[PDB]
């Protein structure tokens, strides 16, 4: 029942199932996982692929020969399992050198080092077949007002992404970039804090067609925002290149619960939207099995991510296919929302006396929207109570 297959395109970061359970107040509760073992275990669960930061796969400061060894072992596990690598990213946050940022660090020599470390891993991602390269600027930001001039930092952020775009085009690489927003943590405030800020910034890059967003359920919810609404705006702009799925219980620290935990109805409306819109990218889980769990709990949590997606997919499809729901959607005038307000044009609107002079505002005000009956049909569908 609800069993994933690789055609469901479920992917996981190496850092997710491999999180050792170090949090700000506590030591690791689990041993390190060898990436090869994660690939094999995830393949057995029905995953389609894995993702990585450079430093997940190649220990920081590895020699060039150790580096090849690590990559070759990893390549063999991908070949043995059929697993793909659709996304890769750079760790620009763990090492102390990045304590004030990578691309927007105040120290210029750190910024140059951040760019070189990124470019090296873009080459590796292309060689492994990644289509999307994610940037999460977790250290770009500030705890205090005077520490970061945000206009200068946005100049430096645009400089860095423009150079990366020049690099991939000059190499002929078929890879796109996706910015992963997060509003805070580990910095007091992070630059480009939401999907909207990231989309707006992309429009000022030299080659905006190369850049999209990689939104994460829990991150938008850390600002109290509606995640399906943000995703709909990203889809509307043609910029949903990738997505991070997980769970979050409101405005607090980044929990990274398994997908379906946290705000369950928001998960339902997210799956409805992704499936209706024909999103065809990876269904990626950026999640942390809680540090209460041993390795059996890690794999149960990973399996639950995909199970919950597949249950919600079924319930959302049943909802949209239900004749009674389709009648309710017309009762609530969703059909009218999809029609142009004024395809007849400005001048026709200005001369149309039924739009103002003879508009019966009181009759229009009296029409109920029937949204509550519609929402309870959606609840009944989610719960399998019809």
């Amino acid at each position: 029942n609800y069993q994933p297959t690789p055609e469901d395109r479920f992917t996981f970061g190496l850092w997710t199932v491999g999180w050792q359970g170090r949090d700000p107040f506590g030591d690791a509760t689990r041993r390190a996982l060898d990436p090869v073992e994660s690939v094999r275990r995830l393949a057995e669960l029905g995953a389609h692929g894995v993702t990585f930061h450079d430093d997940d796969l190649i220990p920081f400061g590895s020699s060039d020969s150790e580096r090849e060894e690590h990559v070759k072992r990893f390549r063999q596990a991908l070949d043995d399992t059929g697993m793909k690598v659709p996304m890769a990213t750079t760790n620009l946050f763990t090492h102390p050198v990045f304590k004030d940022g990578g691309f927007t660090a105040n120290d210029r020599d750190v910024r140059r080092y951040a760019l070189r470390k990124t470019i090296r891993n873009i080459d590796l991602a292309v060689e492994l077949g990644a289509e999307t390269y994610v940037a999460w600027g977790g250290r770009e930001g500030a705890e205090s007002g005077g520490a970061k001039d945000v206009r200068d930092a946005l100049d430096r952020m645009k400089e860095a992404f423009d150079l990366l775009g020049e690099y991939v085009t000059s190499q002929g690489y078929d890879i796109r970039f996706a910015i992963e927003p997060k509003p805070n943590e580990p910095r007091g405030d992070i630059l480009l804090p939401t999907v909207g800020h990231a989309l707006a910034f992309i429009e000022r890059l030299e080659r905006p067609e190369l850049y999209g967003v990689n939104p994460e359920v829990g991150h938008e919810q850390m600002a109290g925002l509606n995640f399906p609404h943000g995703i709909a705006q990203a889809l509307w702009a043609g910029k949903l290149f990738h997505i991070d799925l997980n769970g979050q219980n409101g405005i607090k620290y980044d929990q990274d619960l398994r997908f379906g935990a946290g705000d369950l109805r928001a998960a339902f409306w997210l799956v409805d939207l992704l499936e209706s819109a024909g999103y065809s990218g990876p269904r990626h889980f950026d999640f942390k099995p809680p540090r209460t769990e041993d390795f059996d709990g890690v794999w149960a949590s990973a399996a639950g991510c995909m199970r919950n997606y597949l249950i919600l997919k079924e319930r959302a499809a049943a909802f949209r296919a239900d004749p009674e729901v389709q009648e309710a959607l017309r009762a609530s005038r969703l059909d009218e929302l999809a029609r142009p307000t004024a395809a007849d044009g400005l001048q026709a609107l200005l001369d149309d006396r039924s739009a103002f002079e003879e508009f019966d505002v009181d009759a229009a005000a009296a029409r109920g929207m029937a949204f509550e009956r519609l929402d309870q049909l959606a609840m009944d569908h989610l719960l399998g109570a019809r």
Copy 2:
């Protein structure tokens, strides 16, 4: 001491000092103010101008002759006082007809009526000399997931703003539009919920140069966002057309406290930024004198808005002029943040062995950023403790 003059460009909405104190749980505590009396009282306090919704100035459903009478009375008070009207906006939220929105209402005939009501007031704003026309889509949004297809709604929102842009260009009007974001309240979630979402949406309009943002302190803070950071991004994009100043205590209902209340250090960093960047638009207060107050309290609260701006302006100027602060900014490498990361270009960066192969990451990691000493110099300046 700290006395405003009209050259400080302080402005107030008629609805601010005129708020009667009706909240969701309580009746009005103050009588209605005649707009003429507000103009005179605000002029005496040192205000530069006032703003209005159509329905603040002309009671909803007024006949064409009553309408002229109301406008003429208002015009006379502006002439008697020297007060300007730099901004106007449309009430598309109070009347029951707008219960599901104006521009993105599901009912098409409401959307057409919303546009006609807006166009009528644009003509009036131009006649009164307004430079900026604000749109706050307070009813555009939803309480439940199925009620609003957000892609269709964004289509309708873009349709509405494109028609308004076609209207002002066809009339030859020298007016620009500013979208005022708000994340929630009165709708469960509002479309374009933050400065970032609004900036991103503007880039998809037919004539993006006509549209900017009118951010409000308290609204970004209702999503827990850093308001000076958002304003810096708006300035960076060239889109800060107008600003709403007030106070808010965190993530809760929209409080609209007087400016300087709420997050006081954020107010300090906001004034520092506006003054450093040479923002030359109106300093507009979108605030509500608490319903505990009588009319003497209303004017004390209005006066406090401008007093707090002028005190913070002095402290921010003293901060930036202090030699010890300028030395601290260099100690924290804000000068280096302003320098290009790689003006030498991509190829030079790729060949620069000091950027990677011979970069001493450990020496760079060991450098403190000296941000705490800088922040305490900013605290001492704010408090007048130096």
Copy 3:
């Protein structure tokens, strides 16, 4: 399917289905409901009873004869339908006189008036058979720090509740009090903001056995708190006298959505707890049908409150009855949580070398808690996916 009967003890406030849809930004969208019509409509839906504020039932400032007329009409509808009145409360928030509070208003004469208005309605509630008298101190609090000395206000709050307790005991009334906490709105901060603060305050009253709490789902969630956890603490103290059920989407204005909307998994864990603990008080809905709805939407929303309770009751019962869940609970040592840590006593614990000197902390640390498999069994049960 899932049809309520009066033995389910579902109750509604007159102010809930009768909310006209006035919010801070908008006029009423629905006409006023006659209380008699609400009683009849709710009885047809399967409700067990209704609740009221004094001013819902008797218009403010009614003459003594109008007052009797209103009560007699209401009594007749209760007799015609079989509806009960298990709870009543006082409106100490709508009238302008209460703009700074009722029991903790700075003006002494307002505080005395607040007490007299309350006592009058206690007599009426007893005559209608109410077992619980609720106090929601919505105006008790402040927007600014100097306006309210909170120690003096707590003195005044304790004075008011002590007098009410002296009044009911001197009259021989069999009624108890329940304080309904709320953290903010309409005041910037409200006194006794959470279930915990209210429970702590009760312990300083002269006769604490007379006072309990009436927590509301959405109010605890406006502080980001776990509502089932708070209810468990109230049950643990023996103080859950009444409960308000509704929905809320996180930290924002008080939404009062229908129960089951908002945080659906929290609703599941709440129903599990109430049913497991044998809570036998009313299942009261303090909710507002959204102002998008006409009267048919009002009754659909009311019906959905009880439907969602009954669906969640079934799923929680199925969860606890499942042998596989009972095995998982033992796997996660919930049985051990219920056993005393040290029934052998302090001295035995101090001499027990297996508790410290010879405790194998590393073996104990290695035990997984199996919480994720348990939580996914709870998800499968909630969704009907087993």
Copy 4:
């Protein structure tokens, strides 16, 4: 200017200035500090004393002889500097064995070990002269609903604190306990999440006079609560045994900024209250110098904690001493808030026709509270603008 002396009773935890800068996303940026060096550096800055967890002072798993060595070195530094140790606490959160809690872990043998580890450190704290023993239950809680039966956990929490009270009374120790609440982080929800929940729980302990609260600025603000209001309630109950001072920017991860950062006006109202109430306990800083800082930044941040307290103390004293403020407080009827509502008693209130039958509610409603003029006098005082 604003220089602390040991009579200001400023104290710091060893873990504060000694925080190495490991956060969930990043390695340590600073080396470990020897406790002896912290004591000497803090003494030079004007601190009065230090606090510790057992594991800060004695590395976990130390032999009994290493333990004595560590204590003796520490004792010598206290003797050389005059520094006191007024508070101590237990680390029941770092080691993996505590991943599901100490006192409320599901595993019984962990709970017994938690108690033995605590008792051992109580003996050490008494020997060092500590008056207060703090308990922060950072691991007591849950990420999912089924993992923790909260009634059973509260039984186990009460069992643990009752045993500790029996232990200190049987030994004749003159030490009191203080519970430090926190709503979340590192657990998804923590038990006893606010000052109110902790105060309520204390009233069910066997010997409630032994237990008080140790509230922390940032923790109450992580639930969006008003921290001066919570402290006033703790003072009102006679339970403010200790306090943790720091800064926090709203509802997000626990930032532990230096005191005065975060919500500056809340810091002003906190200092006003502590000084007015004659709080005579330690002014303890539970803060983390940001990981951007080197060791010079650590000591600058520590110094800023005490500087900001002393500046706010001066401004609050000036505020309360100002004749114009004292007149404003009477104008806003704070004098009337301090007077009994009904010292004449219930029967006199019931017969007093001026309290209801002849009360002029409209005249009373018309009185402004003059709270805005009062709040602007407080702003002017805080900023030194008078």
